Tab-separated table of C-alpha atoms (C1' of nucleotides) in Angstrom:
chain	number	residue	atom	x	y	z
A	28	UNK	CA	-50.445	-25.014	47.373
A	29	UNK	CA	-54.203	-25.529	47.283
A	30	UNK	CA	-55.231	-27.606	44.239
A	31	UNK	CA	-56.906	-25.551	41.514
A	32	UNK	CA	-60.129	-26.986	40.077
A	33	UNK	CA	-61.786	-25.556	36.974
A	34	UNK	CA	-65.530	-26.234	36.753
A	35	UNK	CA	-67.056	-25.569	33.336
A	36	UNK	CA	-70.854	-25.806	33.279
A	37	UNK	CA	-73.663	-23.663	31.857
A	38	UNK	CA	-76.078	-24.734	34.633
A	39	UNK	CA	-75.500	-22.056	37.260
A	40	UNK	CA	-77.197	-24.238	39.877
A	41	UNK	CA	-74.963	-27.250	39.252
A	42	UNK	CA	-71.972	-24.944	38.939
A	43	UNK	CA	-72.763	-23.361	42.309
A	44	UNK	CA	-73.450	-26.658	44.092
A	45	UNK	CA	-70.160	-28.097	42.820
A	46	UNK	CA	-68.180	-24.966	43.657
A	47	UNK	CA	-69.541	-24.822	47.206
A	48	UNK	CA	-68.851	-28.505	47.816
A	49	UNK	CA	-65.285	-28.294	46.487
A	50	UNK	CA	-64.552	-25.169	48.524
A	51	UNK	CA	-65.830	-26.976	51.597
A	52	UNK	CA	-63.281	-29.639	50.650
A	53	UNK	CA	-60.581	-26.949	50.589
A	54	UNK	CA	-59.925	-26.498	46.865
A	55	UNK	CA	-59.493	-23.260	44.946
A	56	UNK	CA	-62.451	-23.352	42.562
A	57	UNK	CA	-62.741	-21.444	39.306
A	58	UNK	CA	-66.010	-21.310	37.387
A	59	UNK	CA	-66.791	-20.859	33.695
A	60	UNK	CA	-70.274	-20.604	32.217
A	61	UNK	CA	-69.460	-21.525	28.596
A	62	UNK	CA	-67.047	-23.650	26.612
A	63	UNK	CA	-65.083	-20.757	25.117
A	64	UNK	CA	-64.517	-19.072	28.473
A	65	UNK	CA	-63.838	-22.500	29.953
A	66	UNK	CA	-61.174	-23.219	27.332
A	67	UNK	CA	-59.569	-19.804	27.804
A	68	UNK	CA	-59.514	-20.289	31.570
A	69	UNK	CA	-57.995	-23.758	31.195
A	70	UNK	CA	-55.196	-22.395	28.991
A	71	UNK	CA	-54.599	-19.385	31.247
A	72	UNK	CA	-54.796	-21.114	34.628
A	73	UNK	CA	-53.587	-24.680	33.927
A	74	UNK	CA	-55.980	-25.925	36.634
A	75	UNK	CA	-55.228	-29.050	38.620
A	76	UNK	CA	-58.541	-30.596	37.495
A	77	UNK	CA	-61.211	-29.823	34.892
A	78	UNK	CA	-64.861	-30.721	35.397
A	79	UNK	CA	-66.509	-30.428	32.006
A	80	UNK	CA	-70.259	-30.464	31.419
A	81	UNK	CA	-71.378	-31.862	28.089
A	82	UNK	CA	-73.920	-29.413	26.588
A	83	UNK	CA	-72.121	-26.067	26.612
A	84	UNK	CA	-73.271	-23.344	24.173
A	85	UNK	CA	-71.422	-22.396	20.965
A	86	UNK	CA	-68.892	-25.175	21.585
A	87	UNK	CA	-69.883	-28.707	22.524
A	88	UNK	CA	-68.138	-30.339	25.454
A	89	UNK	CA	-66.476	-32.860	23.152
A	90	UNK	CA	-64.826	-30.168	21.031
A	91	UNK	CA	-63.642	-28.407	24.191
A	92	UNK	CA	-62.114	-31.606	25.547
A	93	UNK	CA	-60.439	-32.383	22.213
A	94	UNK	CA	-58.943	-28.900	22.049
A	95	UNK	CA	-57.644	-29.209	25.611
A	96	UNK	CA	-56.009	-32.483	24.591
A	97	UNK	CA	-54.475	-30.752	21.549
A	98	UNK	CA	-52.707	-28.033	23.579
A	99	UNK	CA	-49.391	-29.180	25.017
A	100	UNK	CA	-50.061	-27.078	28.127
A	101	UNK	CA	-53.406	-28.775	28.828
A	102	UNK	CA	-53.000	-32.228	27.240
A	103	UNK	CA	-52.211	-33.789	30.624
A	104	UNK	CA	-54.943	-32.072	32.652
A	105	UNK	CA	-57.442	-34.695	33.905
A	106	UNK	CA	-60.997	-34.252	32.583
A	107	UNK	CA	-64.034	-35.381	34.593
A	108	UNK	CA	-66.979	-35.164	32.207
A	109	UNK	CA	-70.430	-34.172	33.443
A	110	UNK	CA	-72.944	-35.732	31.075
A	111	UNK	CA	-76.683	-35.983	30.966
A	112	UNK	CA	-76.082	-39.661	29.983
A	113	UNK	CA	-78.917	-40.875	27.802
A	114	UNK	CA	-77.782	-41.994	24.361
A	115	UNK	CA	-75.117	-44.451	23.265
A	116	UNK	CA	-74.069	-42.042	20.510
A	117	UNK	CA	-72.904	-39.379	22.924
A	118	UNK	CA	-71.239	-42.322	24.655
A	119	UNK	CA	-69.487	-43.307	21.398
A	120	UNK	CA	-68.308	-39.774	20.692
A	121	UNK	CA	-67.053	-39.353	24.242
A	122	UNK	CA	-65.170	-42.622	23.769
A	123	UNK	CA	-62.935	-40.613	21.397
A	124	UNK	CA	-62.766	-37.281	23.207
A	125	UNK	CA	-60.054	-38.339	25.608
A	126	UNK	CA	-62.157	-37.855	28.688
A	127	UNK	CA	-60.731	-39.310	31.849
A	128	UNK	CA	-64.052	-40.091	33.526
A	129	UNK	CA	-67.789	-39.517	33.222
A	130	UNK	CA	-70.267	-38.617	35.930
A	131	UNK	CA	-73.993	-38.883	35.246
A	132	UNK	CA	-76.290	-36.088	36.351
A	133	UNK	CA	-77.817	-36.255	38.949
A	134	UNK	CA	-74.766	-37.281	40.974
A	135	UNK	CA	-74.167	-37.779	44.661
A	136	UNK	CA	-71.810	-35.178	46.103
A	137	UNK	CA	-69.764	-37.912	47.768
A	138	UNK	CA	-69.200	-39.666	44.425
A	139	UNK	CA	-68.073	-36.394	42.847
A	140	UNK	CA	-65.624	-35.862	45.695
A	141	UNK	CA	-64.331	-39.431	45.361
A	142	UNK	CA	-63.641	-38.959	41.660
A	143	UNK	CA	-61.933	-35.637	42.354
A	144	UNK	CA	-59.707	-37.331	44.932
A	145	UNK	CA	-58.812	-40.213	42.609
A	146	UNK	CA	-57.953	-37.947	39.681
A	147	UNK	CA	-55.859	-35.707	41.902
A	148	UNK	CA	-54.079	-38.696	43.431
A	149	UNK	CA	-53.318	-39.781	39.878
A	150	UNK	CA	-51.860	-36.491	38.653
A	151	UNK	CA	-49.289	-36.616	41.468
A	152	UNK	CA	-49.120	-18.425	30.927
A	153	UNK	CA	-50.986	-15.624	29.135
A	154	UNK	CA	-54.207	-13.905	30.213
A	155	UNK	CA	-56.628	-14.861	27.440
A	156	UNK	CA	-59.897	-13.854	29.156
A	157	UNK	CA	-60.821	-11.001	31.482
A	158	UNK	CA	-64.270	-9.557	32.077
A	159	UNK	CA	-66.025	-8.908	28.764
A	160	UNK	CA	-63.190	-10.061	26.448
A	161	UNK	CA	-62.276	-13.506	25.341
A	162	UNK	CA	-59.379	-13.432	22.915
A	163	UNK	CA	-59.537	-16.224	20.339
A	164	UNK	CA	-55.958	-16.660	19.107
A	165	UNK	CA	-56.713	-19.566	16.793
A	166	UNK	CA	-59.152	-17.428	14.810
A	167	UNK	CA	-57.741	-13.924	15.392
A	168	UNK	CA	-61.112	-13.019	16.818
A	169	UNK	CA	-62.337	-11.328	19.944
A	170	UNK	CA	-65.437	-12.173	21.888
A	171	UNK	CA	-66.361	-8.760	23.252
A	172	UNK	CA	-69.140	-9.289	25.725
A	173	UNK	CA	-71.319	-11.483	23.486
A	174	UNK	CA	-70.320	-10.228	20.018
A	175	UNK	CA	-67.692	-11.678	17.695
A	176	UNK	CA	-65.248	-9.138	16.269
A	177	UNK	CA	-62.830	-10.080	13.499
A	178	UNK	CA	-59.368	-8.588	14.037
A	179	UNK	CA	-56.324	-8.310	11.809
A	180	UNK	CA	-53.099	-9.912	13.049
A	181	UNK	CA	-51.508	-6.659	14.210
A	182	UNK	CA	-54.739	-5.427	15.752
A	183	UNK	CA	-55.116	-8.742	17.569
A	184	UNK	CA	-51.536	-8.741	18.848
A	185	UNK	CA	-51.909	-5.122	19.946
A	186	UNK	CA	-55.115	-5.882	21.819
A	187	UNK	CA	-53.466	-8.895	23.448
A	188	UNK	CA	-50.448	-6.814	24.451
A	189	UNK	CA	-52.824	-4.345	26.083
A	190	UNK	CA	-54.764	-7.160	27.752
A	191	UNK	CA	-51.554	-8.512	29.266
A	192	UNK	CA	-51.245	-5.099	30.949
A	193	UNK	CA	-54.928	-4.515	31.732
A	194	UNK	CA	-55.403	-1.511	34.033
A	195	UNK	CA	-51.805	-0.342	33.534
A	196	UNK	CA	-50.587	2.266	31.070
A	197	UNK	CA	-48.559	0.683	28.270
A	198	UNK	CA	-45.886	2.836	26.668
A	199	UNK	CA	-45.691	3.103	22.859
A	200	UNK	CA	-42.069	1.927	22.945
A	201	UNK	CA	-43.077	-1.231	24.781
A	202	UNK	CA	-45.745	-1.915	22.170
A	203	UNK	CA	-43.224	-1.399	19.358
A	204	UNK	CA	-40.758	-3.798	20.968
A	205	UNK	CA	-43.254	-6.482	21.989
A	206	UNK	CA	-45.633	-6.510	19.009
A	207	UNK	CA	-43.339	-5.259	16.254
A	208	UNK	CA	-39.967	-6.028	17.780
A	209	UNK	CA	-38.934	-2.588	16.632
A	210	UNK	CA	-36.458	-0.222	18.181
A	211	UNK	CA	-37.915	2.096	20.842
A	212	UNK	CA	-36.995	4.977	18.541
A	213	UNK	CA	-39.008	3.957	15.499
A	214	UNK	CA	-42.052	6.017	14.565
A	215	UNK	CA	-44.799	5.254	17.095
A	216	UNK	CA	-47.388	7.026	14.938
A	217	UNK	CA	-48.230	3.756	13.196
A	218	UNK	CA	-49.414	2.357	16.530
A	219	UNK	CA	-51.701	5.344	16.985
A	220	UNK	CA	-53.486	4.409	13.761
A	221	UNK	CA	-54.135	0.791	14.704
A	222	UNK	CA	-55.344	1.695	18.207
A	223	UNK	CA	-58.231	3.618	16.703
A	224	UNK	CA	-59.294	0.589	14.710
A	225	UNK	CA	-59.615	-1.342	17.961
A	226	UNK	CA	-61.753	1.500	19.284
A	227	UNK	CA	-63.722	1.456	16.044
A	228	UNK	CA	-64.377	-2.221	16.616
A	229	UNK	CA	-64.784	-2.143	20.369
A	230	UNK	CA	-65.969	1.155	21.671
A	231	UNK	CA	-69.642	2.155	21.562
A	232	UNK	CA	-68.477	5.683	20.691
A	233	UNK	CA	-65.045	5.936	19.039
A	234	UNK	CA	-64.933	9.656	19.779
A	235	UNK	CA	-65.451	9.147	23.514
A	236	UNK	CA	-63.613	5.867	24.151
A	237	UNK	CA	-64.457	4.331	27.523
A	238	UNK	CA	-62.276	1.175	27.544
A	239	UNK	CA	-59.242	1.986	25.362
A	240	UNK	CA	-58.134	5.092	27.239
A	241	UNK	CA	-55.325	7.438	26.275
A	242	UNK	CA	-53.000	8.393	29.131
A	243	UNK	CA	-51.613	11.649	27.773
A	244	UNK	CA	-47.840	11.471	27.565
A	245	UNK	CA	-47.788	7.822	28.652
A	246	UNK	CA	-49.683	5.683	26.154
A	247	UNK	CA	-52.775	3.500	26.136
A	248	UNK	CA	-54.620	1.631	28.853
A	249	UNK	CA	-57.259	-1.064	28.563
A	250	UNK	CA	-59.580	-0.656	31.545
A	251	UNK	CA	-62.175	-3.369	31.727
A	252	UNK	CA	-65.079	-3.548	34.170
A	253	UNK	CA	-65.100	-6.387	36.644
A	254	UNK	CA	-67.456	-9.253	35.826
A	255	UNK	CA	-69.836	-7.967	38.516
A	256	UNK	CA	-70.625	-4.874	36.401
A	257	UNK	CA	-71.146	-6.524	32.988
A	258	UNK	CA	-74.943	-6.235	33.227
A	259	UNK	CA	-74.639	-2.436	33.121
A	260	UNK	CA	-72.489	-2.330	29.959
A	261	UNK	CA	-74.074	-4.856	27.571
A	262	UNK	CA	-76.943	-2.493	26.773
A	263	UNK	CA	-74.347	-0.025	25.478
B	13	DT	C1'	-54.612	33.472	26.895
B	14	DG	C1'	-51.366	31.868	23.885
B	15	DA	C1'	-48.749	28.278	22.697
B	16	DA	C1'	-46.214	24.089	22.600
B	17	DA	C1'	-46.823	18.939	22.065
B	18	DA	C1'	-49.113	14.945	21.716
B	19	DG	C1'	-52.767	12.335	19.654
B	20	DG	C1'	-56.157	11.585	16.174
B	21	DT	C1'	-58.642	10.736	11.339
B	22	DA	C1'	-59.100	10.328	6.511
B	23	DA	C1'	-56.414	9.244	2.508
B	24	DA	C1'	-52.960	7.277	-1.543
B	25	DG	C1'	-50.326	4.123	-2.202
B	26	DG	C1'	-47.803	0.244	-1.731
B	27	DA	C1'	-47.011	-4.632	-0.125
B	28	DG	C1'	-48.676	-8.992	0.359
B	29	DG	C1'	-51.585	-12.763	0.246
B	30	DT	C1'	-55.128	-14.963	-2.039
B	31	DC	C1'	-57.617	-16.238	-5.765
B	32	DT	C1'	-58.706	-17.267	-11.251
B	33	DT	C1'	-57.427	-19.655	-16.077
B	34	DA	C1'	-54.435	-22.163	-20.796
B	35	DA	C1'	-50.742	-25.828	-21.154
B	36	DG	C1'	-49.139	-29.812	-20.017
B	37	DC	C1'	-48.321	-33.848	-17.679
B	38	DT	C1'	-48.600	-38.521	-15.313
B	39	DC	C1'	-51.228	-41.649	-12.771
B	40	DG	C1'	-54.475	-44.993	-11.572
B	41	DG	C1'	-57.993	-47.897	-13.017
B	42	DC	C1'	-59.725	-51.105	-16.061
B	43	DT	C1'	-59.211	-55.010	-18.926
B	44	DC	C1'	-56.995	-59.046	-20.046
B	45	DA	C1'	-53.278	-62.160	-21.427
B	46	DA	C1'	-49.951	-64.156	-19.096
B	47	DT	C1'	-48.470	-66.316	-16.474
B	48	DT	C1'	-45.962	-68.230	-10.621
B	49	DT	C1'	-47.934	-70.639	-5.901
B	50	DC	C1'	-50.734	-74.178	-3.905
B	51	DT	C1'	-52.751	-78.354	-2.953
B	52	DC	C1'	-54.238	-82.667	-3.920
B	53	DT	C1'	-52.721	-87.114	-5.979
B	54	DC	C1'	-49.346	-90.511	-7.403
B	55	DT	C1'	-45.179	-92.126	-7.523
B	56	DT	C1'	-40.600	-93.050	-6.578
B	57	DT	C1'	-36.971	-93.336	-4.425
B	58	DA	C1'	-34.117	-93.081	0.526
B	59	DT	C1'	-33.344	-95.625	4.454
B	60	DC	C1'	-33.505	-99.534	7.430
B	61	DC	C1'	-34.066	-104.503	8.582
B	62	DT	C1'	-33.117	-109.681	8.049
B	63	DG	C1'	-30.852	-113.446	6.125
B	64	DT	C1'	-26.396	-116.396	3.482
B	65	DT	C1'	-24.929	-123.245	4.620
B	66	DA	C1'	-18.247	-126.936	1.355
B	67	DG	C1'	-14.366	-125.262	4.907
B	68	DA	C1'	-11.956	-122.052	7.051
B	69	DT	C1'	-10.285	-120.877	13.702
B	70	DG	C1'	-3.958	-116.089	17.367
B	71	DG	C1'	-1.282	-109.390	13.837
B	72	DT	C1'	2.048	-105.897	11.062
B	73	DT	C1'	4.536	-102.784	11.235
DNA sequence: TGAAAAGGTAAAGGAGGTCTTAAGCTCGGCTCAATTTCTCTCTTTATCCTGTTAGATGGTT
């Protein structure tokens, strides 16, 4: 297969330069503009390499790297740190983050490609983020576009179950079995209650839900806009 | 057009986890006698070396 590289950087210009140069080198590149989305993508995709900028918003690059090292699924993924390199203290804190390498900005493209090759020569399953939602399992929270929403455990698990089947209709019996482990024949009415809470937290108008749709006779569907349309929905 | 038939919403109540205090304990620190190691001297043995002037001169079992 083509090696998967995850680039995590809030500088869209650096992110684009890197992505273009890696694609020219034949890799499958994935991009993330912030540390939370980057972490979710790393967990979901298990990329073959992570390039990790230092100064990401809401979550510093060090905390992201440490969390990747704490997850058994990502602990072995090589981390090439992108750093603005200027103070020995960021040096000292990176010395504990478990980074595999550092690359100082500005970098030569050839050096970047050399490091990518060396890390790859050395190395040799749940959707947690789609469009406007990051799910934050560790905190039972959802990032919905740019707002934090606190969820209860059952509401979170229900929303995750729907996210796993984004764009498909999920039957109430499947929700009972997967989230509650209950028999298909138990009362599904309880689910109907908790679904509205998600709408209460997530829809702009709970009476005219746009994203948590009801498929009459079939169940519930989470339909999310593609990332290309997000700019039209945030104002809502 | 009337009528199932499903899907919502707003409660009441419970279930469950998370907080608050009076009772009691026991745990470490602090002091402070009370001592076992340590490290020098200071000896004191433990071990080896050399010499001995009457005369003597072939085995037991």
